Every structure is written in C-alpha cells, then in structure tokens.
Symmetry: C3
Subunit: 200 residues, 3 copies
C-alpha cells in the first residue's frame, strides 16, 4: 500500500553495516517515493572498531578522520556483495519491519541514470553538451552526539561507484578536521532527496 512506497533497513536495525570491520555499525536509511523524487532520512551509529570512540589526539592520520559507506545496486536495484550495508534486513516496509521474502525489483528507488550519469567528462565537451559533476552530490554536515560543536563533513553521491560492476549507487562520505578526543561516531539525522529512476 504505502509500504511499497518505502524501502528501509528498519527504523531500529541490528548491526547491519561495515565501516571498518564486518557489522561494526548500524545504518538506519529510509527511502520513500513522493512522485518523481526519493525522500530519504539516514543515520549512522558505529558500535565497535576504528570509529566507535574517535580519538584523533592518540590517532591522528587521514584514515582515522574519514570513512565512507556504499550502497551498490544491479540493474533491478538489488544490493550487490561489495556493499557496506548487509542485505538481510534491507527490504520493503511492513508495519515497522520488512516483507517476509527478499525483493525482486526496486529500480524505482534508484538514483536517475540521466540526472546522475556514472562518469562526466567536460575536457573537450562543447558548452551545450556539458554535464554537471556537482549535481550527483549533496554536501552538508552531521553532528556527533547531536552537538553543534562536533560537525562531520558529509557528502552523499549518486551513481559514483563502479565496484562490483554496479549500475546504481548511494555513497555516504564522512570526514572531519576537528581532532575529536573520545567521541563515538553517533550521528544526527539528515534529510535529503534525489530524482528517481523511471520504472519499466
């Protein structure tokens, strides 16, 4: 009904995500359709590993101050193995859980091919043929422990990845310059939208 309009991890998932090692994080992502767009809410709590309690005082160095989460999808919109997120509880909504069986098609939840092409190349491109790099991209912040003093630079990129010969993709890139001393990666929630691929 309204539930085929939503695809999510669950509102309160079990560990379902690899940031650093297997199942070290809980990603709550809900994708909903309002017509031609997807309306999305995301959140990330990391419960163990390299980012469960950041200390950039005792661990400075690029690799302790950034990471990314990738949703990779095949032609029908099925999650592919190379993904950060586990498929077990990624499915269509049902009264606060997921449908019994794993889904066959979710093309209408995928970021548009046309608005978000895989590669743009404006080296030798005439101006009227030029495409937008930036357009595939939402740049905002989230906040550790929902504290304004603790921003984390968030980039959401559509159809950026090539991993696993995927045809669609949602990437969440996270980075910070503050040197956070003993702060869990526990994010505020973030609203975002993108243009949906057309079914059939």
């Amino acid at each position: 009904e309204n539930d085929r309009r939503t695809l999510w991890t669950t509102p309160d998932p079990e560990a379902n995500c690899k940031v650093s090692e297997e199942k070290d994080s809980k990603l709550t992502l809900v994708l909903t359709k309002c017509g031609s767009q997807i309306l999305a809410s995301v959140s990330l709590l990391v419960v163990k590993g390299k980012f469960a309690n950041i200390n950039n005082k005792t661990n400075p160095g690029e690799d302790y101050k950034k990471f990314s989460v990738k949703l990779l999808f095949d032609a029908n919109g099925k999650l592919l193995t190379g993904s950060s997120l586990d498929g077990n509880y990624w499915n269509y909504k049902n009264k606060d859980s997921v449908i019994g069986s794993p889904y066959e098609n979710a093309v209408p939840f995928m970021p548009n091919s046309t608005a978000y092409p895989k590669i743009i190349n404006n080296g030798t491109a005439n101006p009227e043929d030029k495409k937008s790099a930036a357009k595939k991209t939402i740049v905002t912040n989230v906040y550790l422990g929902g504290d304004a003093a603790k921003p984390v630079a968030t980039t959401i990129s559509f159809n950026k990845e090539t991993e696993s010969n995927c045809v669609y993709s949602i990437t969440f890139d996270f980075a910070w310059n503050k040197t956070y001393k003993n702060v869990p990666f526990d994010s505020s929630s973030l609203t975002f939208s993108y243009i949906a691929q057309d079914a059939e």
Copy 2:
C-alpha cells in the same frame, strides 16, 4: 480529501506560541505524510517579549542567547497543556484552514517510538546495543531576517521530553554565540523529515 495527509497549525497563524510569555510568537509548522516519513516545514517570528528585539550588548547573559519550543503529544497524538504551542489552531487541513472540531487521533504524524525511543539517562556499558540519542536529533541553522550573516544553531529533537506524561515530543532548540544588536528573532523557513509511527 488530501488534507487528511496534512496536520499544520495554519499557513498564516495569529500569535499561537510561547517562547518567553503567553502568545509571544507565531509558529508556522506543517507536517505532511510522505508514506513512512513526515516532511515538515517550520518558521518562528517572535512578536513580543525577550526574543522579539534581541540585544546581547545590553543583555550579555546565557538566558538571552537561547530558547526552546516544545510540542508535547499523548498516546492519541493530541497536544498536551505543557506545550509551547497552543492547540486552538493546531489541527488537520481544510482548504486554507483546519477542520472546526479538534482531532481525536494524529498518531501517524508522531515520531516513531522504535526509531526515536525514550532513553533513561544512567551510566550504561556495552555500546553494541546502547540506543542512540544523536539519531533523535537534526542539527542545522536558521538565519534571522533570512540573512546569512545572522545564524542561529537549531536542534530538532524527537521523543526527548519527560514533561506531562508525553509519549511523543518535537523540541526546537534555538541558540546563538554571536552578539546581535536589535535583531527581531524572525527565522528563515527550515525543511526536515522524520520516521512516522504507524496505526490501525
């Protein structure tokens, strides 16, 4: 018709809200059902009292430099007395207005208990199933006068309040570090979403 999907005060309200004194502010809040999520828009013009002409030069203190707006719901999603907003014109959409008679049940507009649960704040071990307080929070900025130079740090908290045996809450926290000389607290409009509760 499609106004059953909207619960919204009014597009243009009479002073309907308490920041510092009774009916001292005009809160515009619309909540629309986009399936499993609520898409909200919010503005706050304070019309009289302590925040109606901010002067941190003359009043340098903490209590002049922040305030908070609490909406308190019961089990049926009806608005409780403790709330900053008054329920006279808080109701479903009829054309450009509300339905005459106050609503029985708005539970499906409330923030999801599962996504955003009650957390009794005690020293808690084992982060691998501690429920996240950050998740319940959207952190962003509104701009006073719609001017980029005049930011206000804005925290939107779901299911945070303990007051009046509320089951559900939506709390707007406005704070600013900058020292403003005669600026009316007059916010830019802010878009946000959250995961909705389900019903019968």
Copy 3:
C-alpha cells in the same frame, strides 16, 4: 497517473536558463506535490559567460561574486517572459521526458499566497499586524564541484519578485566571499520544500 504530480525541467536538461547571456546555464528544478507541500530539488550548471569559469582573482568586483535566477509565474502558474528560465521544456512529467502540450494551468505547484505574502507597511501594533520577510526565505550553502572547501551562500525566496506583474515567484540567489580561481559554477544539489497554493 502519478506523473501529473511532477512539474520539472527535464532530469538531464538542455541549456535552458539565462544567468548572464541567453542559454548560458542548465538549471535542474524538480517540483513534486507531496500533499500540501512541494518537495523541490534544484541544481545549476553554467556552461558559458561570466560564471562559466569563476576567477575572482582576475574579476574581484561584487558583480562577479553573486547572481540570481528568477522563475516568474501568472495566476495559472505558467512561466512569464522575464524568467531566467526558458519556459519551452518546463512541463509536467511524462515518463523520463515531458508531455506533448505546453503546461496550461499549474497553480497547485506555486508557493502559497497566505504563507509567503507580498511585503507592505509594518508596525509594532499587534491586532494581527506583523509580517515576517524571513518566513519567505530558505537560506543554506551549496558547494561548487561538490567540494566542502567551496561553499556558496544560497537563498531561495517565494513570491518576492515584482518583475512583469507576476503573481508567484521562486528566486535562487547565489553569493560567495571566497576568491575562487578557475571554478565553473556547478552547484551540489539542494533539497527544499514549501507550502503549495490550494487548487480549485
């Protein structure tokens, strides 16, 4: 069916917008009806002229550091002549393309008159007598190249313009202080919502 819910510039549009010269930019604007709000997504690529390759080091004046795009509408919600945007492939969705006929009436997709009204005389007397300019405004940054290091102050504004006896107006205002050196104007995507005009 559901396509009559989307008023859009194509997802992958031809040069369609005047920032500086006729047809110097590709504006992507998607409007979808979600109940009583419009859920919008907006992005701007400039391909020629004065902002096709910003260099505030060679061009340091204000006129090279800011520009605005005006959508102007009439009482049917159809585009007018003064509009930045060429109203020739600006139509209701049909599949991944656009409908045969030009779009007739689209009043349901306009910013709400009551919510965002035209400015008059303001006074401290409060029988009802306050107007918030800010309420009419969403203020945020977008990011050139989708780079965190390259913010641009963005203001969206509803029913503000007076040009060509317009009833309804959407205006995107861009402004930066940073001195960009050989940066195409190519904005990261922006999600936003506003209250719709009530259809009849």
